[PDB]
Design a protein around this nucleic acid. Structure first.
Ligand SMILES: [Ca+2]
Ligand SMILES: [Ca+2]
Ligand SMILES: [Ca+2]
Ligand SMILES: [Ca+2]
Length: 291
DNA sequence: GGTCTAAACGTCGTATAGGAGCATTT
DNA sequence: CAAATGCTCCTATACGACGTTTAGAC
């Protein structure tokens, strides 16, 4: 059974809080307003959604071109709010969450069915994710966006948060570099990685302190990566950590193979031709190459 | 100076995030 | 008949993941 912090960590990675405001002649305000919480994944990781569903006792799961769990009814959203209030997000999504939560409150008390309250919802939507479309701006032209919590000073709340977070955005891959200065002609490196928009670089920096290893990389996305390449950071920090705090989803299979390769590297078989072929074959069966 | 590790640097493709609204039930 | 919510379809970017070169440790 999945840990609650794993869910929050995973949601920090993969979830979305949304407000849809659509024109509807049949409603008294002329508008339909609704809050949503959703996670969407590749079909192959539907099992993650089911584990989440069994835990919260709520949510509607669908599978078509992708896999989704959604919370749209007030009862379902209440479950969502109770959880994240209890196990709070620590990425910038907390600010999206807080906007979302205010809208939810407005709707529960039926203030969205009035014009003033309707107007209030849009200021929240205006500051939520991608904000108001031009069209929504036109219909509600003088909307001033609600205050957004700038999220700062967040401590890693729990080891299972990291596991959930890494299961969404994290990566375990084996890096092979063509390099004539090596006998085999290639360097082999086991790599652990977390990718995130630079808006949360502080958090990534916090994750490095928390795991006591890794470097910060700013690319040429505008995304930042946490990267661990040090062999005995991997051996003595990363692998023991994720052994206790389990990766979920297909990536768990990737982790295990990744773990296996670290052993091979640790025994220097990568510095031999035969071992390198071994490693390549495993690598070819990991991540995107996994069928 | 020869191997090797660490990590700085490079970069593509899509699974994520985020979105909007009609249909059906209450 | 209006409010809730079940259901479905659209967009694209923040991711994941793969490759090379450089600093330097030994
Ligand atoms: Ca993410
Ligand atoms: Ca993911
Ligand atoms: Ca992700
Ligand atoms: Ca992708």
């Amino acid at each position: 059974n999945i840990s609650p912090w794993t869910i929050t960590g995973f949601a920090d990675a993969e979830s979305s809080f949304m407000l849809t405001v659509s024109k509807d002649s049949k409603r008294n305000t002329g508008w339909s307003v609704r809050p949503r919480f959703r996670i969407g994944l590749h079909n192959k990781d539907v099992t993650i959604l089911k584990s989440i569903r069994e835990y919260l006792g709520a949510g509607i799961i669908t599978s078509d071109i992708d896999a989704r769990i959604r919370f749209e009814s007030l009862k379902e959203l209440e479950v969502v709010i109770n959880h994240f209030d209890k196990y709070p997000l620590i990425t910038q999504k907390r600010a999206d969450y807080l906007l979302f939560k205010k809208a939810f409150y407005l709707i529960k008390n039926k203030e969205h069915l009035t014009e003033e309250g309707l107007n209030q919802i849009l200021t929240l939507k205006a500051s939520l994710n991608l904000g108001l479309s031009e069209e929504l701006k036109e219909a509600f032209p003088n909307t001033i966006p609600a205050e957004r919590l700038l999220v700062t000073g967040q401590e890693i709340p729990d080891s299972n948060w990291v596991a959930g977070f890494t299961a969404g955005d994290g990566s375990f891959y084996i890096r092979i570099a063509k390099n004539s200065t090596l006998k085999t002609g290639y360097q082999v490196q086991s790599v652990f990685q977390i990718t995130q928009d630079t808006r949360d670089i502080e958090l990534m920096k916090n994750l490095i302190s928390y795991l006591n290893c890794g470097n910060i990389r700013i690319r040429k996305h505008t995304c930042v990566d946490l990267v661990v390449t040090n062999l005995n950071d991997i051996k003595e920090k990363i692998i023991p950590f994720f052994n206790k705090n389990h990766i979920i989803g297909v990536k768990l299979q990737d982790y295990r193979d990744w773990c296996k390769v670290v052993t091979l590297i640790d025994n220097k078989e990568h510095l031999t031709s035969e071992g390198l072929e071994k490693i390549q074959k495993i690598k070819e069966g990991m991540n995107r190459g996994r069928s």
